[PDB]
Amino acid sequence: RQMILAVGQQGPIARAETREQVVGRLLDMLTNAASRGVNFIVFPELALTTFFPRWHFTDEAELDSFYETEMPGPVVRPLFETAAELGIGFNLGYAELVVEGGVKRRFNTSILVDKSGKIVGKYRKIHLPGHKEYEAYRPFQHLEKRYFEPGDLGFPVYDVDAAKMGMFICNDRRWPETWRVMGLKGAEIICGGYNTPTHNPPVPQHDHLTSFHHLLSMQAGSYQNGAWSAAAGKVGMEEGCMLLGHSCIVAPTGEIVALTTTLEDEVITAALDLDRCRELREHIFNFKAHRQPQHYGLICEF
Amino acid sequence: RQMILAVGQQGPIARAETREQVVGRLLDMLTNAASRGVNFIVFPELALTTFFPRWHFTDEAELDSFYETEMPGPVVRPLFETAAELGIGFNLGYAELVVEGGVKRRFNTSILVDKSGKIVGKYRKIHLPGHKEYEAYRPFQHLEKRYFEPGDLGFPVYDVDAAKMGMFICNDRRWPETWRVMGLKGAEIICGGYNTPTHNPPVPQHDHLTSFHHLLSMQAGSYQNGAWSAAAGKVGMEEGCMLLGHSCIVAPTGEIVALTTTLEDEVITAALDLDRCRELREHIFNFKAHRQPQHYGLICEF
Amino acid sequence: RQMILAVGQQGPIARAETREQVVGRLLDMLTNAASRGVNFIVFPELALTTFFPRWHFTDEAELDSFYETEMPGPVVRPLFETAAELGIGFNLGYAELVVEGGVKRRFNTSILVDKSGKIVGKYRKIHLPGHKEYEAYRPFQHLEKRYFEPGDLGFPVYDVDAAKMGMFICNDRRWPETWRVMGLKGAEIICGGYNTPTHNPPVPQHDHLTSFHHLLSMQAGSYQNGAWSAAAGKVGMEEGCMLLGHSCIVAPTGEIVALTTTLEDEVITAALDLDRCRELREHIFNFKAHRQPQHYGLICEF
Amino acid sequence: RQMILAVGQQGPIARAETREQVVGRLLDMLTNAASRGVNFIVFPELALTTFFPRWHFTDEAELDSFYETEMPGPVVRPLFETAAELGIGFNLGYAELVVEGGVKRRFNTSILVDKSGKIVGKYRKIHLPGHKEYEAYRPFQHLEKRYFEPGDLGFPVYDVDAAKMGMFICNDRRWPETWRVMGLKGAEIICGGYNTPTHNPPVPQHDHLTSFHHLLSMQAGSYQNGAWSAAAGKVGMEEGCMLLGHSCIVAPTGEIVALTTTLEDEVITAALDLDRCRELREHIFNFKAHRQPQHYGLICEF
């Protein structure tokens, strides 16, 4: 009923930093996580590679090298082996390539792994940000819509050891719908990671609100659904692109209870009461008492 | 495409203060607004009377006196007339009593009046907070559920002069769904009033978060829909109950561009560019490019 | 004791844009302000030209071009003339060039003009940020220490009409001592402007905190002295360098009561009540009752 | 250069709760802190008793009972022993009674105790809030100026194991001068406790800014001096009075990195790099390079 939640923030991953190098970095973050007494740690979106959707690819073989064809492969396996050894669970983001009768399916994926090292849940990015094709004016591209298709798992909630946990990935956190769907399935924790450049070329006049919009999204989603949340970022200057920091853990009230201060690998932790959620969900946001879904229909029209 | 939006915050209204006295105060805020170039002013929720839902009534005629059987009545007609010659539209909130089909219908209602002085549209509070029956364990009562039934008009968006405008009322603002429904309808300004006590009897351990939660709600609602918003409180120490100030105006980005500092009658204004919504609605929150209504189904189930 | 205060934020000024053009922009904002009942308006730091300290000048004559040798000169006169006839005071910042006793002195200067139109007071920037020598390993330069000397007027407070007003310029606002010197002289309003790059080459890991540190400083300064403050930015992308927006007005409590949202020429307004200062100065921050200067000595050692 | 910092917030202490009971509450916390891997833990102002300055005293013997005549007494001694044996430093607040030739000295006091159980420093509260004489309209008194005298040690900074640490107490945090004096003695950590009612009887219009004000004070102080800060509250409903929560740990940038969410005994932690201070203190606030104490003279006059 009580647990210790952590965020394993990563600094940049170089274009040619090997998965084995990154697993080692992830491995140390468990280390620091036992030291602050942690039960579950959340790692970033696409946490095994540089953020490749910044580049416009012409060579398919090159592109595929940034995806996982299994999870875990021999390279990533030490990450799991160690989880089952120390008994800490985690949320890991990666690029998932599946081949279905010769057809390649491309997903921005995150999984939930338990004290025992078992994959107990998967999510696939539903809200894919960025643009459809190459744009010369931009210092970097954001080509997620080309390199991934929108996820086909919906927004599920899973038991992970003691807790009901939902997953979001990156831009997902900006949609109230992401949170509401998992709120409606009783998520106690909603977690995921992100890569959020501090510069947006189409709308550079919002650059100085990057931290603001990021924090506003977490605080509001948490509050509105009485859920704990954690956001693990890949942060700092990666391949000449500055990524937003401010990885955080948020209480069901919307209060930020942990915040990272560096642009490097950083473990933050927070003490988690799974019944705290009831301060909102059995009261001001008592759904059975207060929501009027009959009057929300337009939201689900398509 | 550009206008000056205002909020006319009310200091407390005593149980003995007459509707005439209250309309005089409103008249004063109107003329103050004019001096500051204002085209439209948002007034508070149940702006004509003290906040009666805080008391348990056993005499019905005494409960009824707090309602309007017409809008405008002869006492309120001065507000409409003055507003008309000044070319200032307004959002006014009040208790509405209508009798249809052998049923006394009671609503928490707001109207939009355009600058020509035409009542252009109506909203009726859909999310009623508090409780239905008197509760012993409470300092003061909160009986909106007893004295009002849910609104029967959905969340409409109306053309008001040049702008698409939706209303919310008090607790509605706390629900992302309220915002999203009007966002999907293209609302450019979303506005309404509130009475929000600084003490909450079922959860007094959130009392120090009253301002936090109020502004988090407006800011996140505005950002996620690219909407301007304005929120007019009735504030101060009213009949022993302290009401939250911080009446505000909010940009489509979630930035607060005007905020009250007194707990009395006070008019704040901001410059308003309807095209700024585009910044979000043609980009990060392009609903057609990005939204995924087919995974949002659980939200509209009832 | 009551007035309407404005901030006149400027979008960027190119290297080749002329004093008469910039004065044109300033008059427009001045015009917009009068329509909104404004009594006093704050303009930015070095409001008359581009931010020259960003470049290394070898030609002493071209450096001197950016300075004023009189105030107002012929080009700036129309600003004075108009504001005087409207009865609207202003704060204007500029680069000042004065020769006294064989010495060519260069100051980062601001003045207060009252509503009849006399220059009532001058202030010269005391805290010069940046560096003295060209520094290759930074993308843009910040040569204020080279191009100005620290000001020789202290931190004055002047009677401007009904109000006790003090000035700061840019980096001054970050030093609690700026605020406190004027606090101790009874300032009711402390105003000034700034050019604040959103990138900082020595410490780029604070880049995403630029708005935060800017607002923190205003809000803390205002609250601790019980003063209204007003901060006029010159903002947006200027000569390849992006400058912070977020111009604002702040109440004696430290509450932001008006905030800009564009990165362009933009007027914002706020009703100021000079007696609201008492809430802090006759109570929690009553200096006579509470302050212990016997223990502050280390602050004044030089 | 690294260490873990904890805040051990307290929930209410009742008027008749004993010191043995309280020490046991603090012992629990000192214990957890080790389990979480903490090096130094901050406890509240007057952490050994209910907040007695809320009452008007008419009996000296009864008043004296809330004070320590020695540090530690036999009762408090276990706290010293357990912390020393666990190798955890702490900051503890209490009421100090000293006798000098029959003259009684009263102080609102806090001490620093290092890992080895040695008392390495003392601070006595310099800025005493509230009023001096009984005021009947108030639901609780604040009679600190009657029950203590202003502290006589100044704002010292001490070597605590690895760190230079300054102490403030409660209201002290609101004064830029507190922070600046210790900033100038090179504090890397500035910590203390508070009892901060959320209702202030003479200025109730700021009640809903209580968190805002407390946090604003913390963040600005830290940023301005490039110091880590920790603030441990005694919180919750204590003898009828609601005391502010939001105990926190703050980085030298003024970013909150840990925050309490309950109103009961709660332990929070933060990873502190004593060298992060350099980010401020060698750049924007490089005192030697930038400060102008020559011009600050009015600050130190008495």
Q: How many other C-beta atoms are found inside a 10 Å radius of the C-beta of residue B199?
A: 15
d(CA A130, CA A144): 6
DSSP per position, chain C: -EEEEEEEEB----TT--HHHHHHHHHHHHHHHHHTT-SEEE--TTTTS--GGGS----HHHHHHTSBSSTT-TTTHHHHHHHHHHT-EEEEEEEEEEEETTEEEEEEEEEEE-SS--EEEEEE--S--S-SS--TTSSS---HHHH----SS-S-EEEETTEEEEEEEGGGGG-HHHHHHHHHTT-SEEEEEE--BS--TT-GGGGGGHHHHHHHHHHHHHHHHT-EEEEEEB-EEETTEEE----EEE-TTS-EEEE--SSSSEEEEEEEEGGGGHHIIIIIT-HHHH--GGG-GGGG--
- The closest of D56, D208, D239, D15 to D142, measured between CA atoms, is D56
- The closest of D115, D237, D242, D96 to D169, measured between CA atoms, is D96
- The closest of B268, B266, B174, B281 to B223, measured between CA atoms, is B281
d(CA A166, CA A178): 10
d(CA A109, CA A96): 6
Are the C-beta atoms of B107 and B149 separated by less than 8 Å?
Answer: yes
The helix-helix angle for D19-35 and D77-86 (nearest 10°) equals 10
Return the bridge partners of C190, or none. C166, C229
- Residue A22 belongs to what domain range? 1-302
Q: Report the chain D residue with the minimal C-alpha distance to residue C296.
A: D300
d(CA A263, CA C275): 45
Question: Could you tell me how far CA B242 lies from the centroid of its own chain?
Answer: 18
Number of domains observed in the structure of chain B:
1
Give, in degrees to the nearest 5, the angle at Cα C78 between C73 and C82: 140
Residues of chain D positioned with their CB less than 8 A from the CB of B237:
204
d(CA B236, CA B244): 7
**What one-character DSSP code corresponds to residue A149?**
P
Say if the Cβ atoms of D208 and B237 lie within 8 Å.
Answer: no
Are the C-beta atoms of D278 and D17 separated by less than 8 Å?
Answer: no
**What one-character DSSP code corresponds to residue B280?**
I
SS3 state at B130: coil
d(CA C195, CA C170): 7
Contact partners, residue A229, CB within 8 Å, separation at least 6: A189, A190, A191, A218, A221, A222, A249, A250
Q: Report the chain D residue with the minimal C-alpha distance to residue A248.
A: D257
Are the C-beta atoms of A5 and A228 separated by less than 8 Å?
Answer: yes
The catalytic residues of B are 45, 125, 170
d(CA B218, CA B214): 7
Looking at A57-202, which runs of residues are DSSP E strands?
A: 89-100, 103-113, 119-124, 157-160, 163-167, 189-194
d(CA B278, CA B287): 12
Are the C-beta atoms of C7 and C32 separated by less than 8 Å?
Answer: no
SS3 state at B291: coil
Question: Which experimental approach was used here?
Answer: X-ray
Are the C-beta atoms of C41 and C90 separated by less than 8 Å?
Answer: yes
* SS3 letters across B72-90: CCCCCHHHHHHHHHHCCEE
Q: How many other C-beta atoms are found inside a 10 Å radius of the C-beta of residue B190?
A: 29
- The closest of A271, A150, A106, A282 to B293, measured between CA atoms, is A150
Q: How many other C-beta atoms are found inside a 10 Å radius of the C-beta of residue D65?
A: 12
d(CA A216, CA C77): 46
D275 vs A253, D178, D251, D280, CA distance in Å? Answer: 33, 22, 11, 10
SS3 state at B251: coil
**What one-character DSSP code corresponds to residue B11?**
-
d(CA B178, CA B155): 7
d(CA C91, CA C80): 11
- Take residue A249 and report the two structure tokens written for it: 């853990």
SS3 state at B198: coil
Say if the Cβ atoms of C261 and B260 lie within 8 Å.
Answer: no
The helix-helix angle for A176-183 and A210-225 (nearest 10°) equals 20
Which of left, alpha, beta for D258 (phi over 0: left; psi -120 to 50: alpha)? beta
d(CA D122, CA D93): 10
Return the bridge partners of C89, or none. C40
Tell me which chains share at least 3 CB pairs under 8 Å with chain A.
B, C, D
Looking at B10-139, which runs of residues are DSSP E strands?
A: 40-42, 89-99, 104-113, 119-124
Say if the Cβ atoms of C290 and D127 lie within 8 Å.
Answer: yes
**What one-character DSSP code corresponds to residue B234?**
B
B199 vs B210, B243, D207, CA distance in Å? Answer: 8, 9, 11
Q: How many other C-beta atoms are found inside a 10 Å radius of the C-beta of residue A198?
A: 18
The residue whose two tokens read 């409660």 is D170
Are the C-beta atoms of D224 and D285 separated by less than 8 Å?
Answer: yes
Contact partners, residue D287, CB within 8 Å, separation at least 6: D183, D184, D281
* SS3 letters across chain D: CEEEEEEEEECCCCCCCCHHHHHHHHHHHHHHHHHCCCCEEECCCCCCCCCHHHCCCCCHHHHHCCCECCCCCCCCHHHHHHHHHHCCEEEEEEEEEEEECCEEEEEEEEEEECCCCCEEEEEECCCCCCCCCCCCCCCCCCCHHHHCCCCCCCCCEEEECCEEEEECCHHHHHCHHHHHHHHCCCCCEEEEEECCECCCCCCHHHHHHHHHHHHHHHHHHHHHHCCEEEEEEECEEECCEEECCCCEEECCCCCEEEECCCCCCEEEEEEEECCCCHHHHCCCCCHHHHCCHHHCHHHHCC
d(CA A62, CA C145): 50
Return the bridge partners of B285, or none. none
Q: Is D45 a catalytic residue?
A: yes
Candidates B208, B244, B245; nearest CB to D210? B208
Are the C-beta atoms of D71 and D254 separated by less than 8 Å?
Answer: no
Give, in degrees to the nearest 5, the angle at Cα B2 between B1 and B8: 130
Q: What totals of helices (H) and strands (E) does chain A contain, helices first? A: 8, 14
Q: What was the resolution (in A) of this experimentally determined structure?
A: 2.3
Q: How many other C-beta atoms are found inside a 10 Å radius of the C-beta of residue D12?
A: 19
- Take residue D62 and report the two structure tokens written for it: 């009864």
Are the C-beta atoms of A267 and A36 separated by less than 8 Å?
Answer: yes
Candidates A253, A255, A259; nearest CB to D257? A259
Q: What is the CATH number of the domain that holds C268?
A: 3.60.110.10
Q: In a mutagenesis test of the D interface, which of A2, A246, A261, A262 is the best target, namely the one with the most D β-carbons within 10 Å?
A: A261
Give, in degrees to the nearest 5, the angle at Cα D62 between D58 and D64: 110
Q: How many other C-beta atoms are found inside a 10 Å radius of the C-beta of residue D58?
A: 8
Candidates D128, D284, D293; nearest CB to C302? D293
d(CA A87, CA B184): 46
Q: How many other C-beta atoms are found inside a 10 Å radius of the C-beta of residue D254?
A: 26
- The closest of A117, A125, A115 to A77, measured between CA atoms, is A117
Torsion of CA A258, A261, A266, A269, to 10 degrees: -10
Greatest distance between any 2 Cα atoms in chain D:
55
A12 vs A46, A191, A242, D273, CA distance in Å? Answer: 12, 21, 9, 20
The residue whose two tokens read 């983001």 is A93
Strand D266-273 relative to strand D2-9: parallel, antiparallel, unpaired?
Answer: antiparallel
Are the C-beta atoms of C37 and B36 separated by less than 8 Å?
Answer: yes
d(CA C264, CA C272): 24
Say if the Cβ atoms of C216 and D185 lie within 8 Å.
Answer: no
Say if the Cβ atoms of C255 and B259 lie within 8 Å.
Answer: yes
Contact partners, residue C189, CB within 8 Å, separation at least 6: C5, C163, C164, C165, C166, C227, C228, C229, C230, C272, C274
Contact partners, residue D88, CB within 8 Å, separation at least 6: D30, D33, D34, D38, D39, D40, D41, D115
Contact partners, residue A52, CB within 8 Å, separation at least 6: A46, A63, A66, A95, A147
The helix-helix angle for B176-184 and A176-183 (nearest 10°) equals 130
Burial C197-232 (b: 16+ CB within 10 A, else e): bbebebeebbbbbbbbbbbbbbbbbbbbbbbbbbbb
Give, in degrees to the nearest 5, the angle at Cα A175 between A170 and A177: 120
Contact partners, residue C58, CB within 8 Å, separation at least 6: none
- Take residue D42 and report the two structure tokens written for it: 């901050």
The residue whose two tokens read 């100085």 is A208
SS3 state at A269: strand
- The closest of C251, C183, C37, A295 to B33, measured between CA atoms, is C37
d(CA B6, CA B31): 12
Residues of chain B positioned with their CB less than 8 A from the CB of D211:
208-209, 211-212
SS3 state at B170: helix
Q: How many other C-beta atoms are found inside a 10 Å radius of the C-beta of residue B11?
A: 18
Residues of chain A positioned with their CB less than 8 A from the CB of B153:
none
The helix-helix angle for D176-183 and D210-225 (nearest 10°) equals 20
d(CA D198, CA D211): 8
Contact partners, residue B40, CB within 8 Å, separation at least 6: B3, B4, B5, B6, B88, B89, B90, B91, B115, B160, B161
Q: Is D100 exposed, middle or buried (CB count within 10 Å of its CB: 0-12, 13-18, 19+)?
A: exposed
Element spanning A289, H or E: helix A287-290
Q: Report the chain B residue with the minimal C-alpha distance to residue A294.
A: B302
Contact partners, residue A10, CB within 8 Å, separation at least 6: A22, A25, A26, A43, A44, A47, A232, A233, A234, A235, A265
The tally of CA atoms less than 13 A away on the side-chain side of residue C230 is 29
Residues of chain A positioned with their CB less than 8 A from the CB of D4:
36
Residues of chain B positioned with their CB less than 8 A from the CB of D263:
205
Q: Is D120 exposed, middle or buried (CB count within 10 Å of its CB: 0-12, 13-18, 19+)?
A: middle
- The closest of A226, C210, D212, A224 to B218, measured between CA atoms, is A224
Q: Is the peptide bond before C197 cis (omega within 30 degrees of 0)?
A: no
d(CA D20, CA C245): 55
Binding-site residues on chain A for chain C (CB distance < 8 A): 198, 204-205, 207-212, 236-237, 242, 244-246, 262-263
Strand A228-233 relative to strand A248-250: parallel, antiparallel, unpaired?
Answer: antiparallel
- The closest of C134, C119, C129, C136 to C197, measured between CA atoms, is C129
Candidates C180, C224, C290; nearest CB to D299? C180
Radius of gyration of chain D (CA): 18
Return the bridge partners of A95, or none. A108
d(CA C89, CA D30): 59
Give, in degrees to the nearest 5, the angle at Cα D256 between A259 and A27: 25
**What one-character DSSP code corresponds to residue B154?**
-
Q: Is the peptide bond before D72 cis (omega within 30 degrees of 0)?
A: yes
Candidates A37, A255, A266; nearest CB to D259? A255
